[PDB]
Amino acid sequence: SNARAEFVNPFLASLMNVLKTMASLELKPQKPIARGDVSGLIGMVGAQTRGSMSITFDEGLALEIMQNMLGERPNGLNEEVTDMVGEITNMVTGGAKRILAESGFDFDMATPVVVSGKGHTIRHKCEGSIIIMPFSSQWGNAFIEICFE
Amino acid sequence: AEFVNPFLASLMNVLKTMASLELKPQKPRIKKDEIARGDVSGLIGMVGAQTRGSMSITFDEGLALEIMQNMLGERPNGLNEEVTDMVGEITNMVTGGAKRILAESGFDFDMATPVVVSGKGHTIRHKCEGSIIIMPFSSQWGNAFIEICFE
């Protein structure tokens, strides 16, 4: 079913904003196999639609965000890193919610879930268009997946 | 804690009726520092007027393949797109059943869309303000666990 608004752009802008704001780090948007090491996933429910969003990061990239965002700097994944990915997922979703409210595209957010595992893969099971948008940095890559019915 | 039994009963009833497979439930408990790993997980968010939260079902590969063989009559090669589709439908059916039971107790919520994660030995960590409850399960084909958090 066609969306009543282009819901991808606000998630892309919010992710770049949140990482520049909270971690002084800039991601380069890329041209849109897909795997990562730590992912933040959140469900969304609205009147005219329901869906989910995920942000997947390479370990190297998550660690650099950790170093710049909190000062904690472990050599590998841990609870600290997952808490950070969880809060980033909430902030990105919140930023996109505020932008999409301008176009009458309203939704409420659930609570985030964080998955950790070298090279795990993600498959949104929504009956709608699945959009995958990759990002790169000198520390590793990330990708957002979004699907609304 | 009113949401614990409806979710636990729903996973056992979905697998017993739809895949003719019996899971052995261990006593649910507040998750702490305990190891909770699996190979394929279904994750879904829930939003109600006065509550919100998330649920995950994690399966060992052996158990997922056994469920798939029972629900289709042909054992899949590995955790292919057909296995992830099945984990998504199981996540929807378990949440749908819990939602119907909790609605009779005045606990109302709507579900988001399920997301399925694949990765040998991956871990799941819910981030919500309420208590994270883990419900372990066992079978000779492998283990599974439900994690749930409502705020």
Side-chain angles (χ1 to χ4, degrees):
Chain A
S1 189
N2 299 337
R4 304 200 309 103
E6 185 275 305
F7 57 76
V8 185
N9 172 254
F11 283 90
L12 304 188
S14 296
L15 175 57
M16 297 166 69
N17 182 71
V18 163
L19 293 183
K20 178 54 183 299
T21 281
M22 300 287 80
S24 178
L25 185 155
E26 291 181 284
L27 287 184
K28 181 176 186 302
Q30 290 294 340
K31 269 174 277 292
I33 306 175
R35 289 169 163 80
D37 305 326
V38 66
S39 296
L41 302 91
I42 190 160
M44 299 167 284
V45 176
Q48 311 296 337
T49 185
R50 62 187 183 178
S52 50
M53 182 272 292
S54 62
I55 309 169
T56 295
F57 301 95
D58 287 347
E59 186 175 6
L61 178 49
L63 295 179
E64 186 74 358
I65 300 170
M66 264 281 298
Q67 185 185 14
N68 302 352
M69 184 167 172
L70 294 165
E72 291 295 355
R73 182 43 150 69
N75 293 327
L77 297 182
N78 60 8
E79 185 184 0
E80 285 282 0
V81 174
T82 63
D83 283 347
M84 184 193 65
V85 171
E87 194 182 28
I88 290 170
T89 305
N90 276 335
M91 295 184 62
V92 171
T93 304
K97 171 180 162 64
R98 166 52 60 188
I99 293 161
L100 283 162
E102 298 179 21
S103 302
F105 189 101
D106 292 65
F107 65 81
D108 298 316
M109 306 160 38
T111 58
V113 186
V114 177
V115 175
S116 304
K118 189 67 181 176
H120 67 262
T121 58
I122 295 178
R123 266 150 284 189
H124 289 251
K125 297 303 178 175
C126 117
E127 282 295 332
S129 300
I130 303 171
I131 304 183
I132 304 173
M133 296 297 313
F135 290 88
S136 68
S137 73
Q138 52 184 315
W139 304 281
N141 302 325
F143 60 86
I144 294 196
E145 305 197 355
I146 318 167
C147 193
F148 277 103
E149 301 182 337
Chain B
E2 51 182 311
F3 55 75
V4 170
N5 292 342
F7 279 90
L8 189 160
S10 189
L11 174 62
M12 293 178 59
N13 294 338
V14 166
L15 295 183
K16 193 167 181 183
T17 62
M18 300 300 296
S20 189
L21 188 148
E22 190 172 44
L23 286 190
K24 163 62 184 301
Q26 285 71 44
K27 176 170 293 186
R29 50 173 190 269
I30 297 175
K31 183 174 177 178
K32 300 186 191 65
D33 320 351
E34 45 175 304
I35 307 174
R37 295 171 67 192
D39 304 315
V40 62
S41 302
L43 290 65
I44 193 167
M46 290 163 286
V47 176
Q50 289 297 333
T51 197
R52 65 170 172 185
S54 52
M55 185 268 275
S56 57
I57 309 173
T58 298
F59 299 90
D60 287 348
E61 178 167 2
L63 175 52
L65 292 177
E66 196 71 15
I67 295 169
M68 284 288 293
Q69 177 176 350
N70 293 0
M71 298 182 69
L72 303 174
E74 293 178 342
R75 187 181 187 84
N77 188 7
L79 301 178
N80 61 31
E81 282 192 333
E82 199 174 359
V83 174
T84 63
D85 285 352
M86 169 281 284
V87 168
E89 68 191 25
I90 291 178
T91 304
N92 267 337
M93 283 184 291
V94 169
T95 307
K99 172 179 154 65
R100 193 181 295 280
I101 296 163
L102 283 164
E104 298 305 341
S105 306
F107 182 105
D108 296 302
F109 64 81
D110 297 305
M111 322 166 214
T113 58
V115 188
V116 178
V117 168
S118 308
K120 193 77 165 186
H122 70 260
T123 60
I124 296 189
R125 300 196 190 198
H126 291 252
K127 311 293 171 173
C128 103
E129 297 301 306
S131 182
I132 303 168
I133 306 297
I134 182 170
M135 318 175 200
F137 296 89
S138 65
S139 77
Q140 59 167 285
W141 306 284
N143 299 333
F145 52 85
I146 294 170
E147 291 191 16
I148 199 159
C149 194
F150 279 94
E151 57 166 65

